[PDB]
Amino acid sequence: LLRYCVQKHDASRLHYDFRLELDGTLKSWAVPKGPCLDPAVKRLAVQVEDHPLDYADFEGSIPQGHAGDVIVWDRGAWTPLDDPREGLEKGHLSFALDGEKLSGRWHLIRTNLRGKQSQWFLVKAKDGEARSLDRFDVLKERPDSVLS
Ligand SMILES: [Mn+2]
Ligand SMILES: [Y+3]
Ligand SMILES: [Y+3]
Question: Which segments carry the region annotation 3'-phosphoesterase domain (PE)?
Answer without folding.
Answer: 1-127
